[PDB]
């Protein structure tokens, strides 16, 4: 019965390795997955009272991303919050991008002054203004961020308010225009007392 022995171990190793894989893989349905294209962004704030890691991010009320980390800079007194946004929702489809690239340039060359530039300069501007868009998402130049509340009880989350700009921010950059929350004793000090 010496010959059967070997085969038995080989079967074990394979069935067992599969079982280990199954566990490691299947649990990813809930833990360890970003569920996104992975672009990140930064922003700074004056008051982030009641945010949590894993609070939602939205545009127009559509879930668009996650708040990953919160940290304080001790010499500026500002909080820094890091985002994780999903490219499938924030990037432009390439066909849509063609439209975006072209209408952005029409405003930049005709409402603004690129057509008055040396034609060589005009081409240079168009070439890099557009090749730079291979690095962008839909959030424009004037987009706000502010912290948001969820329900009349619940955890605090982050809101993006787009619109009115021409150019776009590159993934990895910092959104500059931000506004902080209000604490309860200071709604009171501002409007009641």
């Amino acid at each position: 019965k010496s010959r059967t022995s070997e085969l038995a171990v080989g079967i074990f190793v394979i069935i067992f390795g599969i079982a280990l894989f199954f566990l490691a893989m299947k649990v990813s349905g809930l833990v360890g997955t970003n569920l996104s294209d992975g672009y990140t962004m930064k922003a700074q704030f004056d008051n982030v009272n009641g945010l949590k890691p894993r609070a939602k991010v939205t545009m127009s009320g559509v879930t668009i991303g996650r708040v990953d980390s919160i940290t304080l800079d001790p010499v500026t007194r500002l909080a820094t919050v890091t985002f994780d946004l999903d490219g499938k929702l924030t990037s432009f489809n390439a066909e849509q991008l063609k439209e975006v690239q072209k209408n952005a340039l029409d405003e930049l060359r005709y409402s603004s002054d690129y057509t008055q530039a040396t034609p060589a300069q005009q081409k240079t501007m168009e070439q890099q203004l557009i090749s730079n868009m291979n690095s962008i998402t839909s959030i424009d130049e004037d987009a706000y961020i502010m912290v948001a509340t969820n329900g009349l009880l619940g955890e605090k989350y982050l809101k993006i308010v787009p619109g009115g700009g021409l150019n776009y921010l590159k993934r990895g950059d910092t959104i500059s225009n931000t506004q902080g929350t209000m604490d309860l004793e200071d709604l009171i000090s501002k409007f009641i007392t």
Binding site: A8, G10, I11, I15, F22, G29
Partner: protein, 254 residues
């Protein structure tokens, strides 16, 4: 000294390899349909003979959940919460585990003991010379009775657990039938609060019965081995149910 553990581990794991090979043969090829008309008999000793235990335990679990839920829920929402918690608890976590372990006990040790004796007495072995493959004649209907029986028992366990929960939570402790029933309908979806209980039940039924057959059909023909096999089938299927329950629930509701 130390190498002893080494050898123990190496051999136990070799055995799992063997079990996998056995399972493949029993499920892979079963052409003898004419003899499978008897599995309905075999079911008598797995399914029919186990309702008393599953039913009594289901009632006690339902009543306990009712009382503990209530003493916590009076501070939060018993009118709405007894309904939702009794039904979700039984459908998602307890019918698939409590019934699975009571079954592993009552059917599992009995089944392994029976195969064990078939082997120890040499009775089983005598069939090889008659040309009747014992896997198709002895093992097949036992493994199948296990697959069908546990899932049906799992449902009954929960059905009784609901009776138990209501019997104390609504009828003795002062709660509305209206909100108990509607609460359950609002939060319990067939897809997939009932369905996931059943899926987990199938997984456990196969894993647990598979082990009971495998250990009963032991290598070493020594009388001491029957008692050892019985203890081990309870221990191994018990840990496997808990291990797999964790992963499956993690996916189903995560």
């Amino acid at each position: 000294t130390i190498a002893w553990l080494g050898r123990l581990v190496i051999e136990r794991i070799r055995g799992i390899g063997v079990a996998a090979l056995m399972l493949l043969q029993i499920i892979f090829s079963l052409p003898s349909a004419g003899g499978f008309g008897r599995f309905v008999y075999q079911m008598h000793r797995v399914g029919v003979m186990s309702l008393l235990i599953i039913t009594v335990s289901g009632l006690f679990i339902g009543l306990v959940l009712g009382l503990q839920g209530y003493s916590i829920l009076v501070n939060v929402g018993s009118e709405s919460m007894l309904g939702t918690m009794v039904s979700l608890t039984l459908l998602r976590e307890l019918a698939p585990v409590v019934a699975a372990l009571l079954f592993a006990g009552r059917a599992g040790s009995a089944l392994t003991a029976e195969i064990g004796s078939m082997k120890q007495s040499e009775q089983l072995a005598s069939m090889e010379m008659i040309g009747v493959d014992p896997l198709k004649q002895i093992v097949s209907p036992r493994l199948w009775a296990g697959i069908v029986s546990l899932p049906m028992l799992t449902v009954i366990f929960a059905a009784i657990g609901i009776v138990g929960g209501k019997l104390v939570g609504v009828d003795f402790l002062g709660v509305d039938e209206g909100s108990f029933w509607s609460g359950m309908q609002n939060n319990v979806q067939f897809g997939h609060d009932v369905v996931n209980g059943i899926i987990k039940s199938i997984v456990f039924a196969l894993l647990c019965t598979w082990i009971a057959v495998f250990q009963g059909y032991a290598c070493d023909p020594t009388p001491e081995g029957i008692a050892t096999a019985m203890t081990r089938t309870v221990v191994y299927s018990s840990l496997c149910v808990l291990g797999f329950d964790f992963v499956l629930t993690a996916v189903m509701f995560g």
